[model samples]
Structure formats: C-alpha cells, structure tokens
Target: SEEELSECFRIFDKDGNGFIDREEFGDIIRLTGEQLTDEDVDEIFGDSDTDKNGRIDFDEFLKMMENVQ
Candidate 1:
C-alpha cells in the first residue's frame, strides 16, 4: 500500500527533485475543487512543510496523507 501511495507523490513531484514545491502543492489542492486562496494554501503548506523549507519531501507528504486518512 505504501508503494502505491508513494506513487501519488511521485506524480505530484513533476520536477522530480524529490520534493513538492508550491505549484505542485497548489495543483493538489485544486484537485479537491475547494477553491483555495494563496493564504489558505500556505496554511496547509505550513502544516505539511514541517522542515519550513518551503518544499515538501516525500516523508513529510506521507505524514500528511496518513493523517488525512
């Protein structure tokens, strides 16, 4: 299951730098069709980007997705 789930992150990390930046993050949010603003996006980003590096690595994304489940 982890392998399958990790694939989702791979798809999101289009630049393939092993991290998800703001653009990719926004794309994920848009998929929910909730119409989030930049501030709201940052709210989610702040929680997910635990290292505060403005980019989300797979480990951090896994944490967030598991929590979501």
Candidate 2:
C-alpha cells in the first residue's frame, strides 16, 4: 500500500515541481476523496510541514505515516 502511494508521487506528478508545494500537497490530500476547506488544508500542511519549508517530500510522507504504521 505504501508502495502504491510512492508510485502516486512518482507516476502521477503529484509533486511534479520536484517538491511538493502547498498546492500540490493540497491536491494529494484530495486523492482520498475528502473535500478540504482552505482552513483544513492549512492545518493539514501545518502538520505535515516537518522541515518547515511549507512543502513535503515523499521521505517526509513516509515519516509522517510512521505513527500509523
């Protein structure tokens, strides 16, 4: 399942600009079919922005999911 998610990042250009910007990260959130309001999106990014760069990379995504796993 995690492999599929990495493939999503690699194949779908979900982070096409070489890094996941807020816009691209927002798009990735919607992949699960959840409708996120701007505020919710802000919070999501707030939580995911580990390096404090306002974007998240696939490596960061993996760490974020570590708790769940």
Candidate 3:
C-alpha cells in the first residue's frame, strides 16, 4: 500500500523535484472537474503546504493521506 501511494506521488510530481508545486497541485485539482478560483486554490495550497515553503513534500502528503485513511 505504501508503495502504491509512493507511485501515485511519483505520478503527481511531474517535475520530479520530490514535491508538488502549485501547477502540479492545480493539475491534480483540475482532475476533479471543479472550477476553483485563485482564492480557492490558495486555500487548498495553504492546507497542504504545511511548512509554507510553496510546495507539498512526500512527508506532508503522506501525513494528510494517512490521517484520512
């Protein structure tokens, strides 16, 4: 299961910098077919970018996903 999640993250991290930036996050959100505005997107970004470094690393993502699971 962890391997599967890592693979999923690899797919999302298109630039392969070991993190998900805004463009990556937006693309992922776009998959849901929702027209999110700048404010909405920013909110989502703030929710995930825990260290506020403008990206979501695997550790932060794993924490969120594991908590949800």
Candidate 4:
C-alpha cells in the first residue's frame, strides 16, 4: 500500500518539506534493527538519493522501498 508507505515517509520527513534528508533516513533505517554502520548508512543514502541532492524525495524513497521488497 503506497498510502501506508507514504505515511511512513511522512514520519521520516521531520521537516515536513516532502523530502527525507540523510539524517532522517538514517534514523528510520537504524530503527529497523539492522547492525548497519555509518558507512552503511552512507552507502544506502548514496544509492537512494539518485539525484545526488543529499535528500530522498518521495519518489526516490518509494523506488528504494520497491527494490527492498
């Protein structure tokens, strides 16, 4: 359900600017209980932030989640 997933994205968009920055993405990913290190976070962020703008837009986030699923 994209709506449910979008709600999840909203939770991470702490600034409510329709974009999830690196820090916010790290927070949620960390909470997933994976033993990922900062480097890992950086790697994931690097991949998801396809535009290299240092933020994950809604479309980018959805694409990443789609890949994960």
> What C-alpha RMSD separates each model from the true structure?
2.0, 3.0, 2.9, 1.6
Clashing pairs for model 2 are none
Assess the local accuracy of residue 43 in candidate 2 as a C-alpha lDDT between 0 and 100. Answer: 86
lDDT of 4 by residue, 5-68 (tens): 8988888788888888888877877655556688988898898888999888898888876654
- Top lDDT: which candidate number? 4
Candidate 1 clashing pairs? none
Worst 10 residues of 4 by lDDT: 27-36
Compared with the true structure, all predictions reach lDDT values of: 0.79, 0.66, 0.74, 0.80
lDDT of 2 at 49: 82
Worst 10 residues of 3 by lDDT: 60-69
Candidate that scores best on TM-score: 4
Model 2's lDDT to the true fold?
Answer: 0.66
List residue ranges in candidate 4 displaced over 4 A. Answer: none
Model 4: how far residue 40 lies from native, Å: 0.5
For residues 14-67, could you state the per-residue lDDT of candidate 3 as single tens digits? 999988888887776675465778778768778878899998888887764453
- Kindly state the number of residue pairs that clash in model 1: 0
Query: Candidate 1, residues 1-69: lDDT per residue as tens digits?
Result: 568768888888888998888888888777546566899887887888899999888888877666443
Q: In lDDT terms, how accurate is model 1?
A: 0.79
Off by over 4 Å in 2: 11-15, 63-69
